[PDB]
Design a protein around this ligand. Structure first.
Ligand SMILES: C[C@@H](Oc1ccc2ncc3c(c2c1)CCOC3)c1cncc(-c2nc(Cl)c[nH]2)c1
Ligand SMILES: C[C@@H](Oc1ccc2ncc3c(c2c1)CCOC3)c1cncc(-c2nc(Cl)c[nH]2)c1
Ligand SMILES: C[C@@H](Oc1ccc2ncc3c(c2c1)CCOC3)c1cncc(-c2nc(Cl)c[nH]2)c1
Ligand SMILES: C[C@@H](Oc1ccc2ncc3c(c2c1)CCOC3)c1cncc(-c2nc(Cl)c[nH]2)c1
Ligand SMILES: C[C@@H](Oc1ccc2ncc3c(c2c1)CCOC3)c1cncc(-c2nc(Cl)c[nH]2)c1
Ligand SMILES: O=c1[nH]cnc2c1ncn2[C@@H]1O[C@H](COP(=O)(O)O)[C@@H](O)[C@H]1O
Ligand SMILES: O=c1[nH]cnc2c1ncn2[C@@H]1O[C@H](COP(=O)(O)O)[C@@H](O)[C@H]1O
Ligand SMILES: O=c1[nH]cnc2c1ncn2[C@@H]1O[C@H](COP(=O)(O)O)[C@@H](O)[C@H]1O
Ligand SMILES: O=c1[nH]cnc2c1ncn2[C@@H]1O[C@H](COP(=O)(O)O)[C@@H](O)[C@H]1O
Ligand SMILES: O=c1[nH]cnc2c1ncn2[C@@H]1O[C@H](COP(=O)(O)O)[C@@H](O)[C@H]1O
Lengths: 336, 337, 336, 336, 336
C-alpha cells in the first residue's frame, strides 16, 4: 500500500483528562504561563487577530484580565500603529493586569508577509508593541520562515511569533528562524472551511502534541482555534500548550469590534473568518455570520478560568507547568 | 510523542454482555450483594445523595425494596439527623426489606469534608445511621482520604464509603484509608457538565474495571452515575460493580423530594446536580438543573430495573450476583450498533 | 485488567462485500441453499415465527416463492396443527415452489419448552410439518438443548432446529443435541429491546461468523434478525449464513396476519415482538407498533432476491455456496 | 475466525492531508495531468457519463476549461456519434482548452458490453472521439475485460478506459487487457444504492490506494464518484488518482442536459443514477431526483480548481505529480 | 350618540362583479383608457413612483406595453430630468406603445410640494415629461391644492395630477384647482402602515366610488395601491377607476431598480414604502422588505391584462368605458 497515514489524529472531543491525586484547591492554583520565551501572562488566554474580535478595546480588556490581545491587520499601518498606542498609553481610574517592565498593558499585533510588512513592523515596534505575530494561513513556508528571521534580525527588541503550523517539522523550522513562540492550528477553527476547501487539517490535540513534542519547551506554543468550552482549554494545556487563542468565544462581547444588531428579538454581532469573502473584500477558506451578543467579556474570562482551575484541581496541578507535564488522557469513542 | 494516552476508555453504550450456557431462570436468580464489606443489600440498587432524589421518604422506600438510600447533605445537621431517625424507627403497617441487626431499616448519609463534618458525623452516628458516605467531587484527594481515615478511627462502629473515584490508584488510596467500599464515577452522570467545564472524566465501564481490578475484592465498589436502563446495571455489575447508585432513574418518582408541578399538560418534578448553581446557592457550576417527568411510585421502577437485571443473569447463566461479576464476557461494539 | 472483551463484534453496517472477478450474470446465479441438513430451499429466505408475520397464508406464499415459513406458536395446539395441514394440503389452480417428496408445500412450526411441548410437537408432526423449530430467547440453555434432543430421539422423521444462539459454544452444544440446523440471533431484531433491558447482544455479522466457524458446515445456520435491505442478506450469507429469517420486511404484507388499519391517510399493519407486553398478554423484551402496508409479499421477495443476485454478480458467485466460501469484506467507519 | 476482513477501508471524510514545507504559491501550481497514458488534460476534472450531466454542450465546456467530458450512452449510435462531431468541430468566436494534435477539443464517449458495442465503437472512432470508455457497474468481469481488449486490438488509434473497479486485482486485469486507464469507484456515488441493494462497496480513498498501489503508475486512474468538495479532489489525488470524475457537482449547471423546472420558488434540474428506474426504462441501483440549478459550470470548475491549488499550496506540491507522490494523511475519528 | 360613521366602507375583497349579458370575447375587448383628461393609454396600468419600482428602465417597459410609469422623486432635479430624457429619447430595433404627438414614449414624474418643486417642474417639463404628479401622502391639503393650481397656471402645456385622496370633497377641491386627474388611495398600499400608525384609511373600493361620484367623469381618477390580482383591477375600474397604479405587482421584475440578491436558494429584490425608514434616510408609515424576483415585467403585465380581459368578457364590456358605466357588484361576507 502507498497510502501514508501518519497517525490517528485526535481533537478535543476524542479525549478526557484523568483525575489524579490532589492536594490543591481550584481557588489556590496558579494560572500564570508563558506567551513567548520573554513574555509571561497571568492567565493563558489570547484574543484572536480578527477584525470581529480584537481591536484596542478588546486588547485593553485582555491585558487588564491577565492575558493579551493580538490586534488584527485588516487596517492600514497608521490605524494599527495607533491601536497599539491606545493600549500602550491606556490609564485606569485590575490586580492581575499583564504589563511590561514600564508598567504598561501589554499588546500584540498581527502582520503578514507581503510587501508592506517591513513598514508595518517598523511602525508597530515604534508604537511600543510587545510582540509581533507573523500571522499566516500556512506558517510552514519559506515566506513565513524568512519573515520571522527578518523581524528577529532587524527588531531583536520585540518578541516574534510565527504560525500557523501543525507539525513538529514546521515548529522546528520556525524555531531555527528565531521565533519566540509558535502558533498551532491548521483546520480547527470554528469558522474554518479549509478542511472542506483544501482537504487540509490536523486534529488540534494531536497537533499540539506534535509541536510540543518536537519543541521540548525551547519555546512556548499558542493553541489557536477550536476552543469551545473551558474543558477544551485544559485538554490543550495538558496536551502541551502554554496558551490558548480564542476567536468565537470572545466574539459578540461588548469589547469586540462591531455594532450590536437587533434581529428577530435577539441581539447579535458579526463573526467571520479572516479568510472569508467579506473579510478579503484565492478561494475563501472561512465563513461569515452572526454570533449572539454576550455582554462584557470579563464574565466569559472568569468562567473559562474557573473551569480550568477546576480541571487543575482534579489533576492535582498546582501551577500551569504541572498540567503540561503530568496530565494523563483516555481516548473515548463516539458514545463517550 | 509526549501525549500520555493510558487506554481507550469504554462507557456503557460501547459494550454488550455475551449470552452463555445457562441453567437458571430469571425468576430464580438471587440479587443479593454487599454495599460495604459489612453491609449486605437484597438488591444492588442505591439511591443518590441528591436533594431531588433521597430524603427519608425515599430512603424508606429503598430499604423496603431491598436496597438503601443515601440521604443528601444539603440540609443542616439537625435536619439530616432527623431524617436518619425517621427511617431508623419507621414501622410498617415487605419480605425483602434491608435491615440492621436490630431489625431496623438501613439508611446511609452523605457528609463532606468542610469544618462542619465532625459534628455532622457524630450526630448521624448518634442517630443510628448505618453508613457514612464521605461524598465529594474528587475523592482522590488528601481531604477525602484523611476524612475517610478519621471516620474509621473515630467511629469504627459504623461503615464508611469514600468517593467519588475513577482509577485503581484512587481506590487503593481509599482502601488504605479504612474505607469499607468506594464510590466510582467521575463525569458519567446525566446532570454532569464536568466533562465540558474541566475536560475531566473516565468512561464508566473502564472506570469500574480499573477500580475493581486494583481492589481484588477487598472492598466492594458502588457504580455511581450514568445508569439509563436495566441493561446498564448488568454491564456495571459484569464490569465489577457490586451495587449501582442512580439519581435520574428515581428522580420524579412519588417518593423523591419536591412538589409535582403542572406544565403544558405533563407533570414534572425537578432534578439537578449538586454542582448546579441552584444546588450551591466560588466554584463554577459542574452540573445542570431541570425538570424530569413525574413517574409515580418508585416501586414500579425498581421492579422493572430488577426484572431487566434478572433477564440478564438468565442470559449469562448467573445464579447469583457474584457469578455475574466473575464470569461475564463482553464484546466491544461500534457506533453503528 | 479484569474486563474480558472477546472481540470488537460487527453488525451489517460495519462491513461491505468486495467485488471480485466474475463470469456469471445476476440473472444466471442460483439461489438454492439448505434450511437444514435435510431440507433445501430454492431461495435462502425464511419468514419469522411471529403472530404478526407468519400464519398459514404467509407460509404458503413463502413456499410458493421457493422459501419456507415458521408458523408461530402463540396459538393453541389444535389451531397450529390446523395451520400446518392448511399449508400441507394447499392446492393451486409457481415453478420455484419448495416441496417435500410428496409434492406438498413445505412448512415449519415453532414450539417452546413449556409443559405443552410434547403434545404440540406430536400434533405438528402428525399434521405433516416439515421441520420443528425449538424457538426460544436463549438457546444456550439446558431446556433448549434437552428439548432439541427429545424431539430428535422421539420424532427422528422430522427435522429440528434450535435457537436462538450467538456463539460458537452454543452452536456446538445444539449440534451435539442433534439439531439439524441452528438459528442465529441474540439482539439484532428490529423490534428487540434486549440490549436495553438486559444489556445482552452479539452484533449479527460477528454472531454468524462465530457460529459458522464453530460448525464447519456440519449443519447450516439461519441468520435471524436485523435484516433491513437486500444488501444485508448478501453479507449474512457471505459471513456464513445459509438462510435468512426476516420479520419486519414481511410484516404489513397482505399475506401477513392481521387487518389493515386506516390512520391519517396512510395504511398500516401491526408488528410487535414476541416478547412485547401485548404478545405476552418476565419483563418485556420487545416493542409493539405499526408498519406501512406493503401489499403482496411476492414483490418484496422478488426485490430482495434481485439484490442478492446483483450481489452475487459483483462477487463472482454462481451459487450460494460460492458466496459462503469466497466473500471478502472490508470494515468501514461511521462516516462511510 | 473464518471472516475475511481485507482491511479497514477509508473514505474521504476519514482522512485529512497534512500541510508540509512549501515554496510555491497556490496561484503558481500546475494542474496538468494525464487522463490516459496518451491524453493529457490541463485540469484533473472529468464530467460523468450520465444523461443528466454530459452531452455535447457540457463536453464542450469541459474541454474549454482544460478537462474532458464523457458523453453518456443512453442514446442511439447515431445521436451519440453526432454529439462527438459537435464537440470535435465546435469553433469559438479559452487559453486552457484541452485539444488534440489538430487543435480540436478533446472528447470521450461511454460504451457498454452489449451487442451494439461493435457498431457504436466504430461510429464513435469514425466521428473522431479521443477516448472510448467501456462503462459498466462491474469492470472486474470477463465481459468488460474482453471488450476492452477488443477495442485496443480493433481500434489501436483510440484510447480506451475500462471501469468501474475498486481493487488492485481488477486494475491489473484491465491493464493486461490493454486499457490506457482505469475508472475507480464501486459504491461511492452520490446517487448510488448499490451499498444497500447488493451490500457491495469499497470506501473510495482505499479504492484509489488499492488501485494506485497495484498499477505502479503504468497507467493513470480516474477517481469516479463521491466527490462533494474540492477538498475531496485533493484527497483523491493525494491517494493516487490522476483525475476526478464528477456527476453531482456538475448536475444542475446550465450546460448539463435538461430543462430548468420551477418548484416552490426554487430552480432545479434533474439528477439521477444510470442504474435508476427512470433511466433504465436488474433491480435499480440508484435514485432519481432534483438538484438545485447552479448556473454556468465555469464558476463551479473555477471554484473547484481554486480549492485544489490551495491544497497544493498547503502541501508544497508544485505540480500534480508532487501531490500524488508526497501527500501525507492522518486518519480522523467521527468527532473529527 | 355623537359618533360619526360616514358609511360601511368596502375594499376589494368585500365585493364581486356580477356576470352580465355579453356578446364579446376577452380577445376582442379594448383596453384603451385615459390617464388624464389629455393623455390616453392603451392599457390602464401605471407603475408606482417608488425608488424600488419605477426609474427610466421600467418607465420604458411601461410605455412599450401601452402604459406609463411615474419616475420617483428620490433623486436630485438633475437626475430626474435625465431619467425623463432617457425615456423621451429612446428607440428600439411594440405596436401598442404609449406615445406623444412626436412619436415619443410617454413618461411621467413625481414632485413634492416644498422648496425645490419650482426648479423640479421646470427641469422636468423642459426635458419633455408628459405628466407631473404632485405626489403626497395627504392630497387634501392646502399644500397640494395650490401646487397643482401653480403647475396648471404656469405650465399649461403639461398635464398635472394631484393626490393622494380618498373622498369626493378632496377630489372636488383638486378638480377646481386645475387637476387633469387625481390619484385615489389613502391606506390601501401593500407596504402601507398608515392604518396602524395613524388610524387613518379608506377602503379602496369605497374610496374609488366616493371620488368617482364627485368627479362625474370631468376628470379620470387613478386607483393607487392595494392591487394584488388582476381581479382587483376589474373591480377598481368597475367602481369608477380609469387606471390602476401598482407598486408591489411590478417590484421584483427585471426592469425595476435595484440588484437581485441571493438568500437561501431563492432570488429577491428590494421593495419598500416611500414612508419607510430607509426611503426617508416623521415616524415611518411604510415597511421595508424583499419580494421574490419575478423576471421580465412583460409576463406580469400580460397576465394582468389577460385577467382584465376575462372580466370584461364576463361583464359584456367591449371597451373600458362599458365596464366603468355598467358594472354591478354584490357584497360578500367573510365566508366568501
Ligand atoms: C483565504 C484565506 O484563508 C485563511 C485566512 C486566514 C487563516 N488563518 C488561520 C488559519 C487558516 C486561515 C485561512 C486556515 C488554516 O488554519 C488556520 C487565505 C489567506 N492567505 C493564504 C491562504 C492559503 N495559503 C495557502 Cl498555501 C493555502 N491557503 C488562505
Ligand atoms: C461545582 C461542584 O460540582 C460537583 C458537585 C457534586 C459532584 N458529585 C459527583 C461528581 C461530580 C460532582 C461535581 C463531578 C465529578 O463526577 C462525580 C463541585 C463541588 N465541590 C467540588 C468541586 C470540584 N473539586 C475539584 Cl478538585 C474540582 N471541582 C465541584
Ligand atoms: C420477554 C420475552 O422476550 C423475548 C421473546 C422472544 C424473543 N425471541 C428472540 C430473541 C429474543 C426474544 C426475547 C431476545 C434475544 O434475541 C432473540 C422472553 C420470553 N421468554 C424468555 C425470555 C428470556 N429468557 C432469558 Cl434467559 C432471558 N429472557 C424473554
Ligand atoms: C442497475 C444498474 O446499476 C448501476 C448502473 C450504473 C452504474 N455505474 C457505476 C456504478 C454502479 C452502477 C450501477 C454501481 C457500482 O458503483 C459504480 C446496473 C447496470 N448494469 C449492471 C449492474 C450490475 N452488474 C452486476 Cl455484476 C451487479 N449489478 C447494475
Ligand atoms: C412618512 C411618509 O409616509 C408616506 C409616504 C408616502 C406615501 N404615499 C402614499 C400614501 C401614504 C404615504 C405615506 C400613506 C397614506 O396612503 C397613501 C410621509 C411623508 N410625508 C408626509 C406624511 C404625512 N403627512 C400627513 Cl398630513 C400625515 N403623514 C407621511
Ligand atoms: O477564515 C478563516 N479560516 C480558517 N481559519 C481562520 C480564519 N480566520 C481565522 N482563522 C483561525 O481561527 C481562529 C479562531 O478560531 P475559533 O476560536 O475556533 O473561532 C483564529 O485564531 C485563526 O487561527
Ligand atoms: O452537579 C453535579 N455534577 C456532576 N455529577 C454530579 C452532580 N450532582 C451529582 N452528581 C453525580 O451524578 C450521579 C447521578 O447520576 P445519574 O443517575 O446519571 O443522574 C450522583 O450519584 C453523583 O455521583
Ligand atoms: O420481543 C422480541 N424481542 C427480541 N427479539 C424478538 C422478539 N420477537 C421476535 N424476536 C426476534 O426478532 C426476529 C425478527 O427481527 P426483524 O426481522 O429485524 O424484524 C424474529 O425472527 C425473532 O428471532
Ligand atoms: O445508478 C447508479 N448507481 C451507482 N453508481 C452510479 C449510478 N449512475 C452513475 N453512477 C456512478 O456515480 C458517479 C457519479 O457520482 P457523484 O459525482 O458522487 O454524483 C458516476 O460517475 C458513476 O460512476
Ligand atoms: O411608505 C408608504 N406608506 C404608505 N403608502 C405608501 C408608501 N409608499 C408608497 N405607498 C403607496 O402605495 C402604493 C403602492 O401600493 P401596492 O401596489 O399595494 O404595493 C404607491 O403607489 C403609494 O401610493
Amino acid at each position: 500500500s502507498m497510502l501514508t497515514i501518519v497517525q490517528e489524529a485526535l481533537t478535543f472531543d476524542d479525549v478526557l483528562l484523568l483525575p489524579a491525586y490532589s492536594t490543591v484547591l481550584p481557588k489556590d492554583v496558579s494560572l500564570k504561563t508563558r506567551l513567548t520565551r520573554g513574555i509571561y501572562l497571568n492567565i493563558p488566554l489570547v484574543s484572536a487577530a480578527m477584525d470581529t474580535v480584537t481591536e484596542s478595546r478588546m486588547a485593553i480588556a485582555m491585558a487588564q484580565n491577565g492575558g493579551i490581545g493580538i490586534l488584527h491587520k485588516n487596517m492600514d499601518i497608521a490605524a494599527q500603529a495607533a491601536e497599539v498606542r491606545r493600549v500602550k498609553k491606556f490609564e485606569a481610574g485590575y490586580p492581575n493586569s499583564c504589563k511590561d517592565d514600564l508598567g504598561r498593558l501589554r499588546v500584540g499585533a498581527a502582520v503578514g508577509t507581503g510587501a508592506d510588512t517591513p513598514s508595518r513592523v517598523e511602525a508597530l515596534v515604534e508604537a511600543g508593541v510587545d510582540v509581533i505575530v507573523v500571522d499566516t494561513a500556512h506558517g510552514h513556508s519559506a515566506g513565513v520562515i524568512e519573515r520571522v528571521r527578518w523581524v528577529k534580525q532587524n527588531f531583536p527588541q520585540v518578541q516574534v511569533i510565527g504560525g500557523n503550523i501543525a507539525t513538529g517539522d514546521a515548529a522546528l523550522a520556525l524555531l531555527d528562524a528565531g521565533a519566540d513562540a509558535v502558533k498551532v492550528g491548521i483546520g480547527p477553527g470554528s469558522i474554518c472551511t479549509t478542511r472542506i476547501v483544501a482537504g487540509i487539517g490536523m486534529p488540534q490535540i494531536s497537533a499540539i502534541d506534535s509541536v510540543a513534542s518536537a519543541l521540548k519547551d525551547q519555546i512556548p506554543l499558542i493553541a489557536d482555534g477550536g476552543i469551545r468550552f473551558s474543558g477544551d482549554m485544559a485538554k490543550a494545556i495538558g496536551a502541551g500548550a502554554s496558551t490558548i487563542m480564542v476567536g468565537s468565544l470572545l466574539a459578540g462581547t461588548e469589547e469586540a469590534p462591531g455594532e450590536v444588531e437587533f434581529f428577530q428579538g435577539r441581539y447579535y454581532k458579526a463573526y467571520r473568518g479572516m479568510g472569508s469573502l467579506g473579510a478579503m473584500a484565492l478561494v475563501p477558506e472561512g465563513i461569515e455570520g452572526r454570533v449572539p451578543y454576550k455582554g462584557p467579556m470579563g464574565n466569559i474570562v472568569h468562567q473559562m478560568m474557573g473551569g480550568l482551575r477546576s480541571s487543575m484541581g482534579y489533576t492535582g496541578s498546582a501551577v500551569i507547568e504541572d498540567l503540561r507535564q503530568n496530565a494523563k488522557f483516555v481516548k473515548i469513542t463516539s458514545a463517550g
